[PDB]
Design an enzyme around this catalytic site. Structure first.
Site, mmCIF file in Angstrom:
data_model
loop_
_atom_site.group_PDB
_atom_site.id
_atom_site.type_symbol
_atom_site.label_atom_id
_atom_site.label_comp_id
_atom_site.label_asym_id
_atom_site.label_seq_id
_atom_site.Cartn_x
_atom_site.Cartn_y
_atom_site.Cartn_z
ATOM 1 N N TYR A 166 29.660 71.269 92.402
ATOM 2 C CA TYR A 166 30.981 71.207 91.776
ATOM 3 C C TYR A 166 32.113 71.646 92.699
ATOM 4 C CZ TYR A 166 28.330 70.254 87.610
ATOM 5 O OH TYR A 166 27.491 69.673 86.690
ATOM 6 N N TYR A 216 15.143 70.557 83.383
ATOM 7 C CA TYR A 216 15.784 71.386 84.392
ATOM 8 C C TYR A 216 16.277 72.701 83.789
ATOM 9 C CZ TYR A 216 20.333 70.020 82.544
ATOM 10 O OH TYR A 216 21.414 69.813 81.735
ATOM 11 N N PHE A 270 18.356 74.726 90.888
ATOM 12 C CA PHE A 270 17.795 73.957 89.780
ATOM 13 C C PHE A 270 16.276 73.951 89.871
ATOM 14 C CE2 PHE A 270 22.088 72.157 89.559
ATOM 15 C CZ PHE A 270 22.284 72.033 88.194
ATOM 16 N N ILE A 311 25.425 65.250 89.879
ATOM 17 C CA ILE A 311 25.923 65.913 91.077
ATOM 18 C C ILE A 311 25.149 65.429 92.298
ATOM 19 C CG2 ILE A 311 26.795 67.938 89.873
ATOM 20 C CD1 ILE A 311 24.240 69.424 90.850
ATOM 21 N N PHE A 333 23.199 78.842 83.774
ATOM 22 C CA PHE A 333 24.372 78.183 83.210
ATOM 23 C C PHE A 333 24.057 76.927 82.401
ATOM 24 C CE2 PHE A 333 23.855 76.518 87.538
ATOM 25 C CZ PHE A 333 23.820 75.140 87.303
ATOM 26 N N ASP A 334 22.823 76.418 82.438
ATOM 27 C CA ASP A 334 22.469 75.218 81.675
ATOM 28 C C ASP A 334 20.962 75.028 81.768
ATOM 29 O OD1 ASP A 334 22.535 72.680 80.245
ATOM 30 O OD2 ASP A 334 22.982 71.597 82.076
#
Lengths: 111, 111
Positions: free
Chosen positions: B86, B30, B103, B60, B40-41
């Protein structure tokens, strides 16, 4: 052996007069680490205190619990068990499932 | 205007045979970005597919919703509204309150 619930240890005492209450905006500096001491976030590194609403679930539960114990000027260590932090989800890349988090927090302002 | 609920867009089709079900372990790659495109990731940056249990709230909500729609080999884009990600907490330093997350996910394995 994580704590049953968030622990607060005040390292340096604040003014003893101005405490956050539910719904207040808090201006705080924080550094957050895992139990192994690995840092995962810090407002101090951004050179800028973090601002948020306390006591209304806009931050992790351990902060809602612990930050209202601080008077302005206090520095404290919060030890937050997984179920009052990010739980089994964690934060992929940064925080493992069920992680106890350590926050060094300084309360700079209450509104 | 975030989505009402998580959107799935399959970019590249998988095998059409092996789909995650509740309780399975998924091995996925991902990359997650904000609506403004800021990453962010990413497991791809770690050079290592992420592994997690799907459908049981260990990730999530948007992932629990969207990943079971993929067959192994699929690449998809998930658009996840804040209340399935979140929420108002976000993740300080990385993810703002109420953020829609994007994502890009590739399902590599189901157990």
């Amino acid at each position: 052996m994580a704590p049953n619930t968030t622990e607060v240890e005040i390292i340096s005492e604040g003014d003893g007069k101005v405490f956050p209450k539910v719904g207040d905006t808090v201006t705080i500096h924080y550094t957050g680490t895992l139990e192994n001491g690995k840092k995962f976030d810090s407002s101090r590194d951004r050179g800028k205190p973090f601002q948020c609403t306390i006591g209304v679930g806009h931050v992790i539960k351990g902060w809602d619990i612990g930050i209202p114990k601080l008077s302005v000027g206090s520095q404290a260590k919060l030890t937050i068990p997984g179920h009052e932090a990010y739980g089994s989800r964690g934060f992929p890349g940064l925080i493992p499932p069920d992680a106890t988090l350590i926050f060094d927090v300084e309360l700079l302002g209450v509104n």
